[PDB]
Amino acid sequence: MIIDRIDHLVLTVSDISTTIRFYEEVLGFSAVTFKQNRKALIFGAQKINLHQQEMEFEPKASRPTPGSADLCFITSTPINDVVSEILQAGISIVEGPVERTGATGEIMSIYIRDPDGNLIEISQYV
């Protein structure tokens, strides 16, 4: 078995609409509906499926929990330009631009939180 990449992942949220607005307006993701009533956010060649509490389709994680996610995204946009966009959006920065370790090398990152409390790390390689 040879694994190439992560295709997508599932986020459990309290309210899909609130989550969709955050990700479309702040990170520029694109919301879509598949299988008649399922929601997902598209970005690059990957996606994130959304499961609302009380509507978590199966199979699912053993302990579905809103606000338990900690994701790092790579941006092609200059990181400083990202900070400003985040600030202009009215979003609070958890931790300003700071050097971190990426999968390949060193990255400069910014941290913010989504509506449920999940930690979102937007980064760029050094």
Instruction: Assign residue 114 the CATH number of its domain.
Output: 3.10.180.10
Helix ranges (DSSP H) in the chain:
16-25, 79-88
Dihedral of the CA atoms 124, 72, 84, 29 (nearest 10)?
110
Q: Are 25 and 16 in contact (CB under 8 A)?
A: no
Tell me how far apart the alpha carbons of residues 55 and 12 are, in angstroms, rounded to a whole number: 9
Residue 75 phi, psi dihedral angles, 5° rounding: -115, 150
Whether residue 22 lies inside any domain: the answer is: yes
Q: Please name every residue paired with 51 in a beta bridge, in sequence order, or none if there are none.
A: 12
Whether residue 49 lies inside any domain: the answer is: yes
Whether residue 90 lies inside any domain: the answer is: yes
- Going by their DSSP bridges, the two strands 70-74 and 46-52 should be labelled as unpaired
- Which single residue is written with the structure tokens 């509906």? 33
Whether residue 87 lies inside any domain: the answer is: yes
Tell me how far apart the alpha carbons of residues 122 and 113 are, in angstroms, rounded to a whole number: 11
Tell me how far apart the alpha carbons of residues 48 and 54 are, in angstroms, rounded to a whole number: 18
Whether residue 1 lies inside any domain: the answer is: no
Number of domains, the chain? 1
Structural domain range at position 47: 7-126
Q: Is 70 helix (H, G, I), strand (E, B) or coil?
A: strand
DSSP state of 65: -
Structure tokens that stand for 44 in this block:
């690059």
Whether residue 19 lies inside any domain: the answer is: yes
Q: Which residues are catalytic?
A: 121
Whether residue 2 lies inside any domain: the answer is: no
Whether residue 34 lies inside any domain: the answer is: yes
